[PDB]
């Protein structure tokens, strides 16, 4: 007598949005924006270095907290908030550019530069850099006169990069607390340091003066760096106040760097990181962190965007 | 105990499919799911879901610093650029979901129409539409006859003469 056509329905359905209507009920829907976070760093299958107290730039100069990292190799590098680049007070010029270079370095390989010295002290140390006693940066040397107020001789040192990849070279300029202290360490007179390469030439004069105490020292060191092309030479001409490099650095390959405040997990694997952890998701969007790095879903402002996975829900009439 | 089709409402009792048949005859009432139409709608939505899950292979690195803030000018340029990108993706995501949902709802009621029209064509001149999404059959159609309509082996010429007499 009668045959009918129909479709399924549910008592209570999910509300979604369309082009022409807000909050229309459908049989089922699924989320497209990821809000679920893994509060750990998933590093499985990645050579991971957790710098901890060591600052990224510290791996180049070598303060005591960075001794175990002087020649690290990694696929994933992790900076921590408590990281410090220095023991003796100071700062890098163009520091952030250098950090970006190092985050993608794949780690560093150190080579001795072969500097020899005569008639001077090379054992300059301080109680700030505690290494079984008063010490200094592991990859640097604090050059001094033999005795107080003695003239520091005029010297010239050169180093040739004989490898296939560019060499990272770092040196320091020492700023004493007073004019008297500068004279005590390096003798009286005008102090000049000139650094020269094929594509780089700069001059430096120390500026003695009082600065706020960091780690008990009012003195400061200015760290400078350059990238030395293969078969090129860097020449150091100086008459005092010079922190000389002991070893040069070479970039190993490719890596990614992150900043995080959460624990590492070698058992889970992920590809999207932020400071709060790892985003592991199949969803196309996320509302967790706009500064996430790696291979990530795109950041959006909305917490929820429900995608219909079923037909419109039309309740049955009693 | 009257029954009505999709134009009127949905069926909260249909369980083994998205679309189906409900009939009324001397033997009683019965309901059966239609697999082809159900599968077709599911095919379109899964294909849609497959696109959504596709992941980018593009890597992004840090260009600013959480611990030691970068210089203010370049930092403001970065923050301004990133927020602009966020606006674009927020717009895309909002538009994408709304656009897809409109299409999913339309394809679902579109599959319903195709099933309805297919049945209308095989029944030919043996039935009339009651306006609620059902067909009033003007000959005697038992469970076996009903099954023939569902699996598309129903022969209209067999019941034509009986139905035409009853209709007129």
């Amino acid at each position, epitope marked *: 007598d009668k045959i009918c056509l129909g479709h399924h329905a549910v008592s209570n359905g999910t509300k979604v949005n369309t082009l022409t209507e807000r909050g229309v009920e459908v049989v089922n829907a699924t989320e497209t924006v990821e809000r679920t976070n893994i509060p750990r760093i998933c590093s499985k299958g990645k050579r991971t270095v957790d710098l901890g107290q060591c600052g990224l730039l510290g791996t180049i100069t070598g303060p005591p907290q960075c001794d175990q990292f002087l020649e690290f190799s990694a696929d994933l590098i992790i900076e921590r908030r408590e990281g410090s680049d220095v023991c003796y007070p100071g700062k890098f010029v163009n520091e952030e550019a250098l950090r970006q270079i190092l985050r993608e370095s794949g780690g560093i390989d150190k080579e001795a530069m072969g500097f020899t010295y005569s008639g001077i002290r090379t054992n300059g140390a301080t109680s700030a850099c505690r290494r079984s006693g008063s010490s200094f940066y592991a990859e640097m040397k604090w050059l001094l006169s033999n005795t107080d107020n003695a003239a520091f001789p005029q010297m010239t040192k050169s180093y040739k990069n004989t490898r296939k990849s560019p060499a990272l070279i770092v040196w320091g300029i020492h700023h004493s607390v007073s004019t008297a202290e500068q004279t005590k360490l390096y003798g009286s007179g005008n102090k000049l340091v000139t650094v020269g390469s094929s594509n780089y030439q700069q001059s430096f004069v120390p500026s003695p003066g009082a600065r706020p105490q960091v780690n008990g020292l009012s003195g400061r060191i200015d760290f400078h760096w350059l990238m030395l092309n293969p078969n090129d030479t860097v020449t150091f001409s100086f008459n005092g106040a010079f922190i000389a490099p002991d070893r040069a650095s070479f970039l190993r390959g490719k890596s990614m760097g992150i900043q995080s405040g959460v624990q590492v997990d070698a058992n889970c694997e992920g590809d999207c990181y932020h400071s709060g952890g790892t985003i592991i998701s199949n969803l196309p969007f996320q509302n967790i962190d706009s500064r996430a790095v790696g291979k990530c879903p795109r950041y959006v402002k909305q917490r929820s965007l429900l995608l219909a996975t*079923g037909m419109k829900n039309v309740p049955e009439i009693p | 105990g009257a029954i009505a089709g999709f134009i009127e409402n949905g069926w909260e009792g249909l369980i083994d499919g998205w679309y189906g048949f409900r009939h009324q005859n001397a033997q009683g009432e019965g309901t059966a799911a239609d*697999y*082809k139409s159900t599968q077709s709608a599911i*095919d379109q939505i899964t294909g849609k*879901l*497959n696109r959504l*899950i596709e992941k980018t292979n593009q890597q992004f690195e840090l260009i600013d610093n959480e611990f030691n803030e970068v210089e203010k000018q370049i930092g403001n340029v970065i923050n301004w650029t990133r927020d602009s990108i966020t606006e674009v993706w927020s717009y895309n995501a909002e538009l994408l979901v709304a656009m897809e949902n409109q299409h999913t709802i339309d394809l679902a009621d579109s599959e319903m129409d195709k099933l309805y029209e297919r049945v209308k064509r095989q029944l030919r001149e043996n039935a009339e539409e009651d306006g609620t999404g059902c067909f009033e059959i003007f000959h005697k159609c038992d469970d076996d006859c009903m099954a023939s309509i569902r699996n598309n082996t129903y022969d209209h010429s067999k019941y034509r003469e009986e139905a035409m007499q009853n209709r007129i």
Partner: nanobody
Amino acid sequence: VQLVESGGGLVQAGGSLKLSCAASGRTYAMGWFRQAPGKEREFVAHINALGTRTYYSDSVKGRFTISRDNAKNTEYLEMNNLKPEDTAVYYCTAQGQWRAAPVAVAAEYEFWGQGTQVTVS
């Protein structure tokens, strides 16, 4: 519902193999996943409940053929032109009801086989 894999073995690079999954009970959409040692479970192929549509991984498309016989309640994976990266433990999967879901997501399948080893060399 229970799933049982069979047909695994050693095979030479460039050769072909045929896996079969015997189901007991009503299955709808089915598929194949694989796991290499120390790696995550990876999608390979999917066939819908009626067998009218098929889906494949990009690394697998054009070489593998998935099919099913609803009379025998069985699923098949024909693997032609095998390469060393195809070496893995293979699992057949099944869904117990009508469902619209992304085929490449393992969590979307509630029934899993025990697995059969396939080694290519």
